Nucleic acid binder design. Sequence first.
RNA 1: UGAGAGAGAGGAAGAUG
DNA 2: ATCTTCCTCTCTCTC
Lengths: 452, 390
Amino acid sequence: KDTFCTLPVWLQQKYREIIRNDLPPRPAPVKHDIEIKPGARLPRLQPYHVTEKNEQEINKIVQKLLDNKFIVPSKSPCSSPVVLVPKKDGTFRLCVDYRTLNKATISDPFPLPRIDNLLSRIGNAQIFTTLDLHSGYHQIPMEPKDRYKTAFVTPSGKYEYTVMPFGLVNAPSTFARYMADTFRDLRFVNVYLDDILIFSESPEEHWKHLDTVLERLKNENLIVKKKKCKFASEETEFLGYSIGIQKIAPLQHKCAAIRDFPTPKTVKQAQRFLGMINYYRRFIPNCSKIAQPIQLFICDKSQWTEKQDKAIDKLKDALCNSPVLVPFNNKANYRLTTDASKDGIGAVLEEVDNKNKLVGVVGYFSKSLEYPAGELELLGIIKALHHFRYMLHGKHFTLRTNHISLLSLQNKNEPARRVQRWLDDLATYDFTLEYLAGPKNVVADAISRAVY
Amino acid sequence: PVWLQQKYREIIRNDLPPPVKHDIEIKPGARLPRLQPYHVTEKNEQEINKIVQKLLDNKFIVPSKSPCSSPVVLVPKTFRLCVDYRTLNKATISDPFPLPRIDNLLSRIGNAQIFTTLDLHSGYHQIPMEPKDRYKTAFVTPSGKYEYTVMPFGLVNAPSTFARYMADTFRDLRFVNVYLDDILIFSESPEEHWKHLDTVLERLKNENLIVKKKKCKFEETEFLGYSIGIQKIAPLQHKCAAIRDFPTPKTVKQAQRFLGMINYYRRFIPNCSKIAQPITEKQDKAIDKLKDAPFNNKANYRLTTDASKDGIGAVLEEVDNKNKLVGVVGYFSKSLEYPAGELELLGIIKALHHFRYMLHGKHFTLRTNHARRVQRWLDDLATYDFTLEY
RNA sequence: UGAGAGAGAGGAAGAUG
DNA sequence: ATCTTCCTCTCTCTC
């Protein structure tokens, strides 16, 4: 876990200045702009009431930013409030609650290729290197014209951003459009939304490759957040896929969740499994007659022999194939459904017609969890959305959840404390919340309640 | 006060001896006001003319033929002058700056002992005007037209201009509360108050801002309409002697005009909102009941919140190293709006929400007894750490 | 005439079941 | 049944 030393000394020395671990103060391309919805009002919000110590800590950060030239003071005619986020580290984070802004701003998502068309490029590559720029946050200039829109307000101040803060609605497209612009003409570099992938077929050619990409970054006055990068290694991770020499295969397959879904022991476990299948009973040739061996065990008394074992695996196979599964498309209307709990999270992304109703599923999600459970469950939900990052990109969807912290985003006012730390990442998804209570959470629950 | 007297006598000096400048930016589409003056009586015009000279006297305004023309207002109390700038303002870009929260200043004082007070001499009038934008302040009196050379009260961004400036100069002194032109400073030891007084007087001297020495006090002051005592905060007798001696409500407004003034002092009146339930032979027992009627960061507290119907009650008290009481820092009460347990929970979260800017998060204790909107209630409750009581 | 703060009385329109 | 967002008005306070 020290892969920079792994690359030649002449490269180490050439780009030492731009492969840093902390952002130096601003040195001054394409910019981030904020186009407002015709007839929308920019926010004119007061700051949130915080305690003495907290505001001290708020001011500590404003200084660090002022000193970094990321913000200058404003006399802006609008303002958004601010939430201090107490990292797990003892440190602190200033998050600007740009929800009211984001509502009033147009979205211009940058069109990205299918991931599988990108992975097709790596071909017979032998070394890979990934570079992190943290999506160009705090680097990409705000458009001078649009800076006042970013204006935050603390209990005793009013500053505006000069570079691209977190929390703004079209951020990752800006960085995406940027990377396309600088790197689209190199057949050895894959770029998408986050990392830059560099692939070559020999470490010989690789250094000449890195030389070009790092130069181009250096000419953009960009900085590579070293600590995140992986340099010239055999294996690397990219776009949720595991990138190998000749082996590309996802970290969590489309159907892993239902495949490794454990065989039931308790009655309840079976009832939950059956309850899930029942939800998509429509997309399957007579599920009522093939769930019989199971349902009978649940119902009255019968042994869980290999006669249930067959029935289960027949129903699993039914969920992992058409017509339960639908070959995703770009113009589709998605809807994500998450239930998290003790121990684990499960979620389901499903297509929906012009009438809000099932056409099928696009992927299931499952993940185990390591305090309190209120905080831990939300992490689960974030990890589910994260999983579906590249598919939900550009799309408006509907997120169903029964997490009272996340649900507080329905109201315009100051959000619940337990959701505030995820305000910045949430802002990059374009979702409508919807409350969830069974039997609509039957799929998600079975996946959730049963971790593997 | 030996050395300080030497150092800042130059700025602690009545009358203003001859940088931040106020700006007035007009929204692109907008046109400036060319308004005709307000009607005035023969004896009002005299009171106007006596002030227009006083303004001309200290060289705050100059007679100038700007194209712009806003009308003037004569305010009773003595009689101050205010220009109606409402048409001007609607043509100027806004500029919202925070003003210190009052609940928030009273809560900072801690167990500070000796408080000095500074009064910025002639308020906004110590803030020059940017000459380019001077002509916009132009106003027609019946006599002739004038122009403010110095920041007049009653422009949109006027409080923000001064509130910024103050915030920037005094944001990082944990012993100084500066609310616009009023500046409190609170210390523990007299020794420590000297070093403190120097520091703020430096900054006031560094900006060539002037204190009106006559108008300020250097072990007990008054501030923001309150009276901050040594180990106490209590409402002053200035506003208390117009509260008992306020005529019993007979009219509709008077019923509101009474709840309205006793409002700002809700902090002191226990079960306040619950005793105004009538506000009619039962209105009388109520206006008389209310007429009758200390936060240190490091200390422990007890939030008590018994709440049934007809109200939700709560008081927060300072408690001994062991237990029981030390004092009271406020009483909270609200009207509404379903089972007591949930009714007593709403009482808790609306109470916690009230003192959140002190209680979140110290380890205090809760004295109290013992579905979606309750999930929410329960979630808010979770972010506080405490321990329930019988 | 200005900026915020508190308490209170009402009104109009939506969304998901 | 849940839950949003927008507006008018009354009384008061701080400077």
